[PDB]
């Protein structure tokens, strides 16, 4: 039984104190969908070059938007597709962008009337197409914030979906998550996707700012457009769950020593373990609170976290055999 591990560390400077970051891989290159707001707001498409992020486009200037929007990126081997959708301030309006080089995006605008997610919360994320019987689908998924009462499984996690790139969003996709608690409330739900495998990553707890616990749910087919999803555990003593990814059909799972995130652990198949200790040379405490995986392929993946200024620590993680 072979195991090969290697760890690299690279730093990146960003002149933009992005309110929220959204990395994705296209070609071999790394990209970020930055959001800057504090009157005027920017959605930069930055790209990693040598040692620093390089802004390439301000999608948001095409606007006709009012304020901060939900962002939905979808990356294929062929072309990136980026949607800028208004959140509720009643049928959805979005701006579609697409590029087959990562540099020159083409503009478009779409409207989905009577849209399936009419009373659901949404959060921005990056994603990959979901193959289904020779039909790949982009999913915009929304979760009900918190359920006060009556037991019902209808739309605890609802998704509307498109198989024509981003152009039309007709299809409905139902998720049956067989779980409930009274004061529990979900946040930041995103679909992890790998081949045909659908999964969801979200935070649980009472209403936002006091979120703590991570939850992850694998999904399996019931119909062509209906999934049943059961919770998958990842708890470890004196460690807080952080993020989940796959390498070679195996899980790689990060944790922190506790909620202050002084150190981060990477766990390969819950067998091998790596410790990332952030070196500190600033008056600010160094930590890995934002750390997230960015899959490259079945062997390589990144672990990224920012710090005091726009200093993106980036661990290049190799693990194979």
């Amino acid at each position, epitope marked *: 039984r072979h195991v090969f591990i290697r760890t690299e560390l690279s730093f990146i400077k960003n002149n933009v104190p992005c309110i929220r970051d959204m990395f994705f891989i296209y070609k071999r290159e790394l990209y970020n969908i930055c959001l*800057d707001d504090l009157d005027e707001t*920017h959605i930069y498409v930055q790209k990693k070059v040598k040692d620093s992020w*390089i802004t390439l486009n301000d999608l948001f*200037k*095409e606007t006709d938007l009012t304020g901060r929007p939900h962002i939905f990126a979808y990356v294929d081997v062929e072309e990136i597709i980026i949607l800028l959708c208004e959140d509720e301030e009643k049928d959805m309006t979005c701006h579609r962008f697409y590029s087959n080089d990562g540099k020159e995006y083409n503009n478009s605008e779409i409207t989905i009337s009577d849209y399936i997610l009419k009373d659901k919360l949404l959060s921005s994320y990056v994603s990959l197409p979901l193959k289904i019987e020779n039909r790949e689908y982009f999913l915009i998924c929304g979760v009900s914030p918190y359920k006060f009462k009556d037991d019902n499984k209808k739309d605890d996690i609802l998704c509307m979906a498109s198989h024509d790139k981003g152009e039309t969003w007709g299809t409905k996709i139902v998720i049956k998550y067989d779980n409930y608690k009274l004061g529990v409330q979900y946040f930041f739900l995103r679909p992890y996707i790998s081949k045909n495998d659908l999964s969801f990553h979200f935070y649980v707890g009472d209403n936002i700012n006091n979120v703590k616990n991570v939850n992850f749910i694998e999904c399996t087919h019931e119909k062509d457009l209906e999934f049943v999803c059961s919770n998958r555990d990842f708890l470890k003593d004196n460690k807080v769950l952080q993020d989940v990814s796959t390498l070679n059909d195996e899980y790689i799972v990060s944790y922190g020593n506790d909620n202050n995130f002084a150190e981060c652990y990477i766990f390969f198949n819950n067998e091998n373990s790596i410790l990332i200790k952030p070196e500190k040379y600033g008056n600010t405490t160094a930590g890995c609170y934002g750390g997230t995986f960015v899959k490259i392929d079945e062997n390589r993946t990144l672990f990224i976290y920012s710090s005091s200024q726009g200093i993106y620590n980036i661990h290049t993680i190799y693990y194979a055999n």
Partner: antibody
Framework: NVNLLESGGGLVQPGGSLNLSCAAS????????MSWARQAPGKGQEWIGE????????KYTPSLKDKFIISRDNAKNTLYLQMSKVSSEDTALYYC????????????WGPGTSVTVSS | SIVMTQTPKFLLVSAGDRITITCKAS??????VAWYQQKPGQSPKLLIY???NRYTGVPDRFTGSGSGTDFTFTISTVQAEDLAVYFC?????????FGGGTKLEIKR
């Protein structure tokens, strides 16, 4: 092949009014942001203002906010700058310019046209 | 209103020489900076956008860089056609103010 042309320049007495037009052709005029800038003699470029294709978003330099007003007609492919209550500071060569795709930069300038304010 | 201080102002140099103007802003302006050239008798032409990107059709000799407060514009091999007035502009927020300009003339 992009082309712009300014019009309406000339002399105007101080405290007066003047209209400036900019015709555009060779590209989709309703597809791009538009902007005004100006050059005082012997001095660097001064940005004036900008407007989005739907005219919903118009922005000015703070000094000119109550003097000039920018507008555009997509049906006529024309940008407009309405000036009034001018003083000697406004004597300048005025440029109208297009923003580039996904950039707040002037990717194409017109030749401009002169404006002089004197008694 | 942000202010853009440009150093230097006059540059006299021979052909084949490198040059590098710098532009310092009063506040952080992220990566949004443009560099323009206007040859005498000409309207300004765009050359650099987002501090370090070529515009289409821009010859390779022109480059830009810098972070945060400060930025640089650079010509690798100055030519007689490059006699001109170069200047920076901040695109981060309105007003999108220009710099003071930099005349560039050549030895012969």
């Amino acid at each position: 092949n992009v082309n712009l042309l300014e019009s309406g320049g000339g002399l105007v007495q101080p405290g007066g009014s003047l209209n400036l037009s900019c015709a555009a052709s060779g590209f989709d005029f309703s597809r791009y942001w538009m902007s005004w800038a100006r050059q005082a003699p012997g001095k660097g470029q001064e940005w004036i203002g900008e407007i989005n294709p739907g005219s919903s978003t118009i922005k000015y330099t703070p000094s000119l906010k109550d003097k000039f007003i920018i507008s555009r007609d997509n049906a006529k492919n024309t940008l407009y700058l309405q000036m009034s209550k001018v003083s000697s500071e406004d004597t300048a060569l005025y440029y109208c310019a297009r923003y580039g795709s996904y950039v707040y930069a002037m990717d194409y300038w017109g030749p401009g046209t002169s404006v002089t304010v004197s008694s | 209103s942000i202010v853009m201080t440009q150093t230097p102002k006059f540059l006299l140099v021979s052909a084949g020489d490198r040059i590098t103007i710098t532009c310092k802003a009063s506040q952080s302006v992220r990566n949004d900076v443009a560099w323009y050239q206007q040859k005498p008798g000409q309207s300004p032409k765009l050359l650099i956008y987002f501090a370090s990107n070529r515009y289409t059709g821009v010859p390779d000799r022109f480059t830009g860089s810098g972070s945060g407060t400060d930025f640089t514009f650079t010509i690798s091999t100055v030519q007689a056609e490059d006699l001109a007035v170069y200047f920076c502009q901040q695109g981060y927020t309105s007003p999108r103010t220009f710099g003071g300009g930099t005349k560039l003339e050549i030895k012969r």
